[PDB]
Amino acid sequence: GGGFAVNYNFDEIIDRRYTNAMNVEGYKGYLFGDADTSDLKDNDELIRMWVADMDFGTPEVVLNAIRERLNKKILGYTNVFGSEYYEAFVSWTKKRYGFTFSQEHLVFSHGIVAGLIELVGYICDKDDKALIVTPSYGPFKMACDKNHISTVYSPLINHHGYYEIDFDDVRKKVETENIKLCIFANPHNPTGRVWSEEELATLGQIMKENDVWLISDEIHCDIKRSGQSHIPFAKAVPDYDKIITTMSQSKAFNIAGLMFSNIIIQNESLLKTWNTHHFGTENPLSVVATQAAYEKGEGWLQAMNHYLDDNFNYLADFLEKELPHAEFKIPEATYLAWVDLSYYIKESMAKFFIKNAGVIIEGAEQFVHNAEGHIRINIAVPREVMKKGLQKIKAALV
Amino acid sequence: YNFDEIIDRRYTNAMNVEGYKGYLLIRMWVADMDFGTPEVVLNAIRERLNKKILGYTNVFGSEYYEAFVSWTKKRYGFTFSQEHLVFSHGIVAGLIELVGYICDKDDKALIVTPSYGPFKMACDKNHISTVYSPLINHHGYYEIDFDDVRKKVETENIKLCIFANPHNPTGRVWSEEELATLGQIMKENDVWLISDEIHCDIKRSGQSHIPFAKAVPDYDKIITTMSQSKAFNIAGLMFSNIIIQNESLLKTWNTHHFGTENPLSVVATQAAYEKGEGWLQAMNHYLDDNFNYLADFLEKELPHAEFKIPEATYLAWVDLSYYIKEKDIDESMAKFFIKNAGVIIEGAEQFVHNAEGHIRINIAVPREVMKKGLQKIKAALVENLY
Ligand SMILES: Cc1ncc(COP(=O)(O)O)c(C/N=C2\CONC2=O)c1O
Ligand SMILES: Cc1ncc(COP(=O)(O)O)c(C/N=C2\CONC2=O)c1O
């Protein structure tokens, strides 16, 4: 059955020390690069609310699938054979979004950023340009950089944390610049928008009219407030084979470390390129984990989302009371809160909050453009941890 | 340990079982083992699952480095610097990336042949042309043609040599003298060398491994790749070591490399270094006994085949030229043996060049499986021969 009867405990404090977790160990390198961080007090017991992995356990249904695979004793060369994996994945997309795609069109990457890097290389020639809306998940730009593809930004319009696409701006840029590709988060990181069919259709008709490819990164699509629906870009715009879809269970099931992602490529030419040029076999533990999420993970994921919704409600009340000049809207999707602290801001905000709050967040410097004065707070943590972090953030701003 | 155990590989999406009607029944083909990954490794992965979260991971601090370098020191007297250790998702992914950084459009790569095929495919993926130096064959004992290598390096724009130490498919464990001589050629011509040492811990009693960078310590363009994937039967975990001693290339890697690591892959690999030596020694003893049977079997039952016990690997390289000519076999020997023996092997076609007439037999299998496979191979060859 679907996992609805089990009581889960999202309040559980799970120790992440001595696990080589980037969340615990690697904030200085990620946030500050090669810069000197000697001014940071090494012995600060930091509350982690930065990188997008969860402090909630990967559900036992997923972990038990990995255990059963280990019991088969050999961890040799693996690939996705037959149709069982495909059937599990398309069953999920059909059921949840009315989205179907052919088995031939499904290929695999070792995480979605690796997929983006490879895709951009195949799609874009040296003098082609890519468009992103801003603020943006940073690896969308890094994937272009890695391929020597220049990026153009279209800043989203912001009303008090409710963001929308400036279609006039996108259209102008697509028409006047050599834009070959748009990389797009549906739903959006860091703003949390769940795009409507109408928004996606409007963007799709700009892309079709201008022969622009669009990669829809839907990795956050199953993390959303109760009652929200997700519409895949390729469902909203079903008449264009240059929409590529990326989805995984990494975010939803807290298995980013397993590096196994779905890429749906509807363009026969690009698919041939992928098929003949893509190198890599698959990790058996990663594939069994992901398949287990699709087949068995429904109940747990619902419970996780319900708990997150209560965390967002607490956060909203907390900000209203304790930081009334901050601006926040509960996002429609993701476990990431985007908070405008422009009023309180008088060095990078990530450095500020580590030094002055003992809290690790992400700031404007992590989101490319159009992010001034904001932080991103990861609240996929026990409510008690979130409370402690919010208290420290508040103390530092006042 | 019970290396005789028959482990079911069906319903595990294993290439070895599902893929052979695609890469081109008793399975003796692709290089993973039918021996279980050792419990000391599996139990490390189980312990890591008990920590509940499988999030973003990298190699932090020095415990991994300490484990790996203690292994290389103990076993080969080889040490290297922590700063020079980076990671790839398997060695072929690492080769593809390294070739891209090292070589430009009109640089060529050199490989000795016969070769592991992905050495050439790593060059093809980077649009780098490959040049072949055929090894010299003395009745299944292979040697480098130093005259040929010297010529090719001097008279063509060879930027990189990709080298297997020990060698696949011939099994050669190169001597200090061989490595020193080859290294000096490369040093004098300013040629990068990638020494792929993935088979280095699978070797006969009485054979000792010398890393290329140990034999040739004063040339910083020797790159070493090592893994526990072959030795511990964990190729599915896709996690590999690369030792880059050249500061410019290391800077390029650190700036341009993308990827995090799989926590289950890292724990597994670290466990093999920290706890694996006893199982590995036992496995090697059992493999040696498989080779002794194979050598006896071929001498008695297929006397026209040419075969030498390989110094390393679990892979037997067998010249069947005599039989192919006498029978006028006009299909690949992998098709021949699937159809006529019900045995899957790798034919000459998988090994780039200088391979015609040979097959490669994987004998990292229970001894009774190997015996059954060798019986069927022999029967298909001697049918209607005197
Ligand atoms: C839009 C988007 N695409 C792709 C990825 C990568 O997912 P993977 O396949 O690597 O699991 C992320 C991860 N979000 C990152 C992780 O750290 N903070 C973030 O926002 C993301 O937000
Ligand atoms: C010399 C050499 N290098 C690298 C690899 C790749 O190892 P990975 O990092 O992927 O574990 C192999 C695997 N040998 C292959 C595997 O199948 N048949 C063969 O000959 C090999 O022989």
Author numbering:
A (entry chain B): -4 to 341, 347 to 398
B (entry chain A): 3 to 26, 41 to 402
Sentences from the paper on this structure:
As we were unable to capture reaction intermediates by soaking ShPatB or BsPatB crystals with Cys-3M3SH, we sought insight into the mode of substrate binding by growing crystals of ShPatB in the presence of l-cycloserine (LCS). LCS is a known PLP-DE inhibitor, that forms an external aldimine complex with PLP thereby inhibiting ShPatB. Moreover, substitution of this residue with alanine abolishes activity both in vitro and in vivo (respectively). Tyr25 is part of a sequence divergent N-terminal region, and this residue is found only in malodour producing staphylococci. This N-terminal region is often unresolved in PLP-DE structures, and indeed, we could resolve this region only in the ShPatBLCS structure. To gain insights into this constrained substrate binding site in ShPatB, we examined a unique tyrosine residue (Tyr25) that extends into the active site in each subunit with the phenolic side chain projecting towards the PLP moiety. In this conformation, the side chain of Cys-3M3SH projects from the deeply recessed PLP binding pocket towards the protein surface. The aliphatic 3M3SH species fits, with minimal steric hindrance, into a spacious apolar pocket formed by the side chains of Tyr25, Val46, Tyr72, Val108, Pro134,Phe274 and Thr276 (where italics denotes a residue from the partner subunit of the dimer).
Once inside the cell the terminal glycine is cleaved by a dipeptidase (PepA) to release Cys-3M3SH (2), which is metabolised by a C-S β-lyase liberating volatile 3M3SH (3), which diffuses or is exported out of the cell (4). While the PatB enzymes are poorly characterised and the genes are not associated with amino acid metabolism gene clusters or operons, the orthologues from B. subtilis (PatB) and Escherichia coli (MalY) are known to have cystathionine β-lyase activity, suggesting that these enzymes might also be capable of Cys-3M3SH cleavage. ShPatB and BsPatB are homodimeric with each subunit containing a PLP moiety covalently bound to a conserved lysine residue in the catalytic site (Lys246 and Lys234 in ShPatB and BsPatB, respectively) in what is termed the internal aldimine state. In the course of a typical PLP-DE catalysed reaction, upon substrate binding, the ε-amino group of the amino acid substrate displaces the lysine residue from the PLP to form an external aldimine.
